[PDB]
Amino acid sequence: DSTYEMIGGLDKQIKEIKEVIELPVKHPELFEALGIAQPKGVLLYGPPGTGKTLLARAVAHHTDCTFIRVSGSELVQKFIGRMVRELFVMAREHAPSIIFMDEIDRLEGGSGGDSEVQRTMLELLNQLDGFEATKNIKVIMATNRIDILDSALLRPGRIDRKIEFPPPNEEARLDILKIHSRKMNLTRGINLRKIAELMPGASGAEVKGVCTEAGMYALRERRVHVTQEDFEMAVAKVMQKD
Amino acid sequence: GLDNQIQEIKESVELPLTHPEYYEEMGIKPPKGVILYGPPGTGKTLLAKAVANQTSATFLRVVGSELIQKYLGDGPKLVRELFRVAEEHAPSIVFIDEIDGEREIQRTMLELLNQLDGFDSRGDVKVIMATNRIETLDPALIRPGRIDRKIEFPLPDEKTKKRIFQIHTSRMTLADDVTLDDLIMAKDDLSGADIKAICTEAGLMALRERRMKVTNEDFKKSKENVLYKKQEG
Amino acid sequence: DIQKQEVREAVELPLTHFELYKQIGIDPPRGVLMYGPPGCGKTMLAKAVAHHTTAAFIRVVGSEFVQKYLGEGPRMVRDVFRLAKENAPAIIFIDEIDAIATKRFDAQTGADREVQRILLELLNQMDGFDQNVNVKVIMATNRADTLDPALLRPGRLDRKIEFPLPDRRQKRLIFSTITSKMNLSEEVDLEDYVARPDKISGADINSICQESGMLAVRENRYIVLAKDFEKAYKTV
Numbered sequence: 001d002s003t004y005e006m007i008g009g010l011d012k013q014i015k016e017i018k019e020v021i022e023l024p025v026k027h028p029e030l031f032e033a034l035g036i037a038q039p040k041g042v043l044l045y046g047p048p049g050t051g052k053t054l055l056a057r058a059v060a061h062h063t064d065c066t067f068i069r070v071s072g073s074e075l076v077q078k079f080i081g082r083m084v085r086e087l088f089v090m091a092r093e094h095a096p097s098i099i100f101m102d103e104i105d106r107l108e109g110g111s112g113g114d115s116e117v118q119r120t121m122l123e124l125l126n127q128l129d130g131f132e133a134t135k136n137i138k139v140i141m142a143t144n145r146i147d148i149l150d151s152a153l154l155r156p157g158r159i160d161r162k163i164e165f166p167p168p169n170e171e172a173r174l175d176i177l178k179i180h181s182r183k184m185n186l187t188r189g190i191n192l193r194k195i196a197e198l199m200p201g202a203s204g205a206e207v208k209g210v211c212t213e214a215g216m217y218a219l220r221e222r223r224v225h226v227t228q229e230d231f232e233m234a235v236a237k238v239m240q241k242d
Numbered sequence: 243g244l245d246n247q248i249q250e251i252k253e254s255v256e257l258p259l260t261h262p263e264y265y266e267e268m269g270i271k272p273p274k275g276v277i278l279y280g281p282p283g284t285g286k287t288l289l290a291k292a293v294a295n296q297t298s299a300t301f302l303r304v305v306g307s308e309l310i311q312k313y314l315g316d317g318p319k320l321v322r323e324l325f326r327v328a329e330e331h332a333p334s335i336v337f338i339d340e341i342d343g344e345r346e347i348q349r350t351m352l353e354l355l356n357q358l359d360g361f362d363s364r365g366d367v368k369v370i371m372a373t374n375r376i377e378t379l380d381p382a383l384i385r386p387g388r389i390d391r392k393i394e395f396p397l398p399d400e401k402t403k404k405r406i407f408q409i410h411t412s413r414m415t416l417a418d419d420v421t422l423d424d425l426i427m428a429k430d431d432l433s434g435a436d437i438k439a440i441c442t443e444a445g446l447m448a449l450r451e452r453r454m455k456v457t458n459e460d461f462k463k464s465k466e467n468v469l470y471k472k473q474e475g
Numbered sequence: 476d477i478q479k480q481e482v483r484e485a486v487e488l489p490l491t492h493f494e495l496y497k498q499i500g501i502d503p504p505r506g507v508l509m510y511g512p513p514g515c516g517k518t519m520l521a522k523a524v525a526h527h528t529t530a531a532f533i534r535v536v537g538s539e540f541v542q543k544y545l546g547e548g549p550r551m552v553r554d555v556f557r558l559a560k561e562n563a564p565a566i567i568f569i570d571e572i573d574a575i576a577t578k579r580f581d582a583q584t585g586a587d588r589e590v591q592r593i594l595l596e597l598l599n600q601m602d603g604f605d606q607n608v609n610v611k612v613i614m615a616t617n618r619a620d621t622l623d624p625a626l627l628r629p630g631r632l633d634r635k636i637e638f639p640l641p642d643r644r645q646k647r648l649i650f651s652t653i654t655s656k657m658n659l660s661e662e663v664d665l666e667d668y669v670a671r672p673d674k675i676s677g678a679d680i681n682s683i684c685q686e687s688g689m690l691a692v693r694e695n696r697y698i699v700l701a702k703d704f705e706k707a708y709k710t711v
């Protein structure tokens with residue numbers, strides 16, 4: 001589900017995005033007094049914020065809409081489907097929907113089939129740019145990895161939305177790390193404040209790096225509860241690759 | 243400030259298929275069309291000028307010429323398909339927008355040059371060309387398309403943006419301190435989507451305090467984002 | 476003294492301590508990936524790990540499920556996975572994944588998208604069964620560029636044992652575990668006989684040694700010597 005109880009730290013950005021996404025949801029009457037239309041979407045460029053998808057699944061979970069991705073990372077690639085019209089038919093039947101690519105986030109064949117997917121979403125943006133079947137059809141890009149150059153280059157911020165997202169709120173390092181500590185078995189004498197604030201410079205992926213790279217020492221010592229010293233070692237275990 | 247211009251070109255484009263007593267009996271027959279262009283471009287200015295013909299008619303929209311470079315050099319065959327479907331769909335209006343090895347581009351450009359003129363075709367449909375800048379394209383495309391008259395985009399004459407602002411604000415709620423002369427005079431080379439964009443973000447910014455009425459200080463405060471954004475790059 | 480301890484505690488410890496991972500709440504990683512176009516392998520480590528423990532094992536040929544069937548795939552992989560998690564703890568060795576991990580735009584070739592939906596389907600089922608599944612799944616490949624980012628994504632393959640430059644200890648190990656079953660002597664030495672196949676990159680070196688056993692099985696010489704090694708290297 002990944003509701004608001006599993007994502008936090010972007011209060012200003014959800015306060016700014018409720019007018020981009022939540023506008024056709026609960027207050028569509030401002031079309032006369034304001035004169036707004038359906039934009040292309042929104043994207044967040046920079047380091048991985050450990051929850052780049054939990055936000056889309058969160059707003060989509062509160063909008064009470066379906067989540068249909070394009071690349072089909074989890075058994076949703078051929079379930080719907082020239083494999084280009086079935087997505088628009090399911091988008092016509094299911095008017096509330098949020099599209100977010102996660103799997104896309106050799107240069108000869110990988111850019112060949114990946115160039116076929118890019119041409120697919122380009123002609124889909126041409127069909128949706130020319131005509132429109134129903135509302136509440138918006139696409140969201142993902143620029144968090146290094147191999148993402150087409151989405152960052154083709155979206156400079158001229159006819160789309162752009163958000164500077166290197167330093168989200170420092171809660172992408174602190175409070176979503178606390179949330180990632182709520183799921184796993186957490187003790188009561190831990191202080192995530194210092195170990196969460198003392199990881200500067202490297203990247204924003206310190207949450208997933210310290211959790212996943214700390215699971216090898218919680219798997220080595222076989223401790224029933226995760227201690228702060230495990231995360232302290234995980235800081236070095238993720239700073240060695242820098 | 244372009245009502246006489248839009249009615250002059252409107253009469254220049256509505257004489258075929260309508261009002262025939264001064265079209266074929268007297269012998270006008272301009273079977274070539276016109277060519278348009280806008281310095282701001284964006285397709286919304288030329289779309290707002292040619293949209294007067296889209297009220298009661300059949301329209302065709304082909305934007306950009308990327309479909310030639312993105313694939314192998316198939317040639318003008320797609321233009322021939324548009325020509326045969328324009329012949330089978332004579333009661334329509336042809337409009338092309340965003341008109342932007344080397345030996346093939348020249349031969350398909352000369353073939354498109356002779357095809358656009360229509361040496362073996364009389365007046366059956368009207369063709370209107372559009373691009374970002376007329377200076378970038380080769381001047382050879384003038385004689386086939388533009389043989390009647392051409393028009394350039396005027397200046398902020400304080401009447402066009404005032405009329406468009408009146409249409410967009412025919413039902414909006416604005417305070418008394420919201421003057422118009424500073425707005426229509428301060429702006430320069432802005433399309434309808436720019437004033438509609440600053441009005442949209444102005445009402446959306448005034449909605450942050452449940453204020454159904456937009457003030458002038460919030461309108462200029464919202465305009466600071468567009469004026470600052472256009473000067474950043 | 477760290478490779479055998481990391482792989483040791485990453486292979487034999489999670490194999491019979493699932494309840495302890497249920498207590499601590501940490502999923503044990505089991506995906507071991509092999510890569511490197513120069514060194515083929517897929518036999519020394521696959522049969523070494525597949526023979527360190529005397530239990531059941533179910534190997535699969537790279538084209539074991541490519542029968543252009545849409546509904547038979549999940550039944551085959553579900554039956555193999557249920558006999559592997561229910562019959563006995565086995566180490567499944569999936570080979571030739573580059574032919575089943577290729578995307579295609581045209582929907583007319585539904586068999587390729589179908590088999591990549593099978594590979595991605597078991598790739599999702601292994602993700603949903605990370606909570607102490609009773610099966611080990613190792614994987615090997617030679618062309619990772621054609622592979623999809625979902626295979627090399629973390630959480631699936633957390634171990635990547637490469638073969639760029641093995642030291643002498645790995646030569647004594649991977650060559651002792653193969654010379655222990657063959658006839659050795661004081662002249663049998665494969666250090667230069669493995670350094671040369673690194674200059675001239677040759678595949679399936681272990682299979683070439685088996686060919687040397689096929690040339691020494693003629694009952695003309697009991698102990699295999701350098702003549703069949705260098706001969707098996709210059710011929711095949």
